[PDB]
Structure formats: C-alpha cells, structure tokens
DNA sequence: AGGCCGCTGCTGCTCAAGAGGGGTTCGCGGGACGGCATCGGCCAATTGGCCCGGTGTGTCGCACGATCTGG
DNA sequence: CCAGATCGTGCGACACACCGGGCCAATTGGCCGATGCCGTCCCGCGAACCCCTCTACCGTGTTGAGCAGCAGCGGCCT
C-alpha cells in the first residue's frame, strides 16, 4: 500500500543563513502573565491576542482598545416574550395569579 | 514523505559540485550569479542591489549575468552538471 | 443478641424535509496601470595580421673531396 | 684492385631568430536611444458557500491454569 500525510518538505537547513530582522512586542494578562512575541518589522500589531499562561484575552501594554458591541446576545426567554405576547395579557394573567395565590 | 539517504546525499553532492563549476568562472560573473540567485545566502536580490556592490550600471548586470549563462550553457562545461538534471 | 474468629464459595485479573434570510468566499472577467524587454545604429578600442629593415645563428639543398668497407 | 656511403668541408639558400617598429583587418559589445507587450493589482459583479432559523391534527420506554480479594455463614465469646 502507499500513503501519504498532507505534509510538505524542504532539502533545506539551518546552517549559513541569516535571519531577518524581528521586533518583540510584549503582552500582558489579567492576572499579571508577561509575554513577549515576535514578529517581522514590515508587520502590522494586532491590539489583541491569547496568553501564553492560562489562555485568556490580553492586550498590549498600552492600551488603545475600545468596545464594539456584539450583535447577538439576545435570545433569552423575555424577549421572546415581548414577541410573542403585548404586555396587557402578561398585566392580566398577573393580575389572576395574584388574586388566586392571595385567595 | 520520508527522507531518503540516498536523495539527500545526492542533492548534497549537486551542491558542492554547483560552487566548484562556478569557481573557474571570473570574480565578478561568479558573484554576479550568485547574488542573483542567493545560492550564498538564499534570498535573490535585485539588479540595483547586485549592481550597488560593483557600482556598475543595471544594464550591465543584465549583459553580465547573461554572458555567464550563454558560458555554463555551452558543450564545454555542462558535462560536469548534466548528470544531476 | 452483637462482636468477632475463622471457613468456604464466589468473583475478578493475567499468562499462554423542506423553505427563508444573510454574511463571506472566490471566481471569473476586466481592464488599467506601470514597468522592463527587444531592435536600427556605431565608432575607435585591446588582442592579432602584416609587413619594412638590418644582420646573425642555425637547419637544409646541394657541390668538391678524403676514408673506408664491401663488391 | 677501386667506387659509392659516410662524412668533412664549403657555398649558397633560406625558414625563419631576433627585437624592435608602424600601421591595419576582423570583430567588436556595450546597451544609446526608441518603441512595444506582459505582470500585477484594484476593483466590479456575480455564482456558490456556509451558517442560522422556523413548522402547531399527533406523537410520551433500549479454556485452562494460577493467584488474590470480598461476601455470606458456622460457630465461639461476652
């Protein structure tokens, strides 16, 4: 039989090359994780990433990040409520549960 | 996708064989070659850059570079690399 | 009648079904832009021709002439 | 005996040896400068591509062997 993982190779090595510049930005976490990442100068830096310690949110160490709400936290069973029903029926069968559970 | 001994030691060999058939050539064609094609370093620099080293014209490293190809592509030195193709 | 000391049996582990709505991809084209690639000239530059002008030194083509071996 | 091969010697030719002159043929090879077609990119629209959402007659159950530990029970002991 043959076959083959989808991977690729290079006849390539790490002996009499010269390495293009980086720049390390550093990031910080919550709970106080520093980190430091590298990346090429012809690069643009992203105002976010993950932690390298406990993979949670982190940003630079300057900070320039607003929010932008998210669209889609609505789906809960009130609103569906106000969909499904104006609110003098929800006034009224309030109005019958109270005097039955007062009763 | 397993490296094989053979193809390894094989390509090894083309590449030292490539430097020598490069040495009988002049200074300059050698160096003009190798730039170009980054054999020394790996990343192809531009005629400008080849040409700033020597500070001859861009059009000169054009006609430069293509004498060493008509020289390498001649009944008389590709015996040596025709094997490996 | 509960606690506890053994027996004895049992079990377990291991070796050989549609419809609508919306953001995103990519895929064709589609052309615009900028760029480098290809073709008449062109003259006065190193090597290498291509010789004059002297002899000499040294090979070769042949004349006079002596020695020697064979005929 | 003596005459041509071999060699000595001589005269000439002479194919160049020189080392120096004085111009030239061929043959340039660069890109000079001018002209022209292709690579890259930036939209432009549209086909498809993947994700999310909703539908209300009703309907209510998937072998043998070897070794070791635990549960039940007979029977003292208090």
């Given at each position: 039989l043959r076959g083959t993982r989808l991977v690729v190779t290079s006849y390539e090595t790490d002996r009499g090359i010269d390495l293009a510049p980086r720049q390390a930005v550093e990031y910080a976490c919550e709970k106080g994780h520093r980190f430091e990442m590298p990346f090429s100068v012809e690069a643009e830096i992203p105002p976010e990433w993950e932690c390298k310690v406990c993979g949670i949110q982190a940003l630079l160490v300057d900070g320039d990040g607003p929010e932008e709400k998210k669209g889609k936290p609505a789906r809960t069973h009130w609103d569906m409520l106000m969909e499904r029903r104006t609110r003098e029926e929800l006034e009224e069968v309030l109005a019958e549960r109270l005097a039955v559970l007062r009763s | 996708e397993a490296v094989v001994p053979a193809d390894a030691v094989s390509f090894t060999l083309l590449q030292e064989q490539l430097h020598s058939v490069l040495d009988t050539l002049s200074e300059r064609e050698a160096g003009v070659v190798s730039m170009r094609f980054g054999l020394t370093d790996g990343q192809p620099k531009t005629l400008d850059e080849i040409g700033?080293?020597?500070?001859?014209?861009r059009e000169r490293i054009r006609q430069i570079e293509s004498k060493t190809m008509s020289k390498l592509r001649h009944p008389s030195r590709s015996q040596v690399l025709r094997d490996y193709l």
């Open positions: - | 700033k080293v020597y500070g001859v014209t």
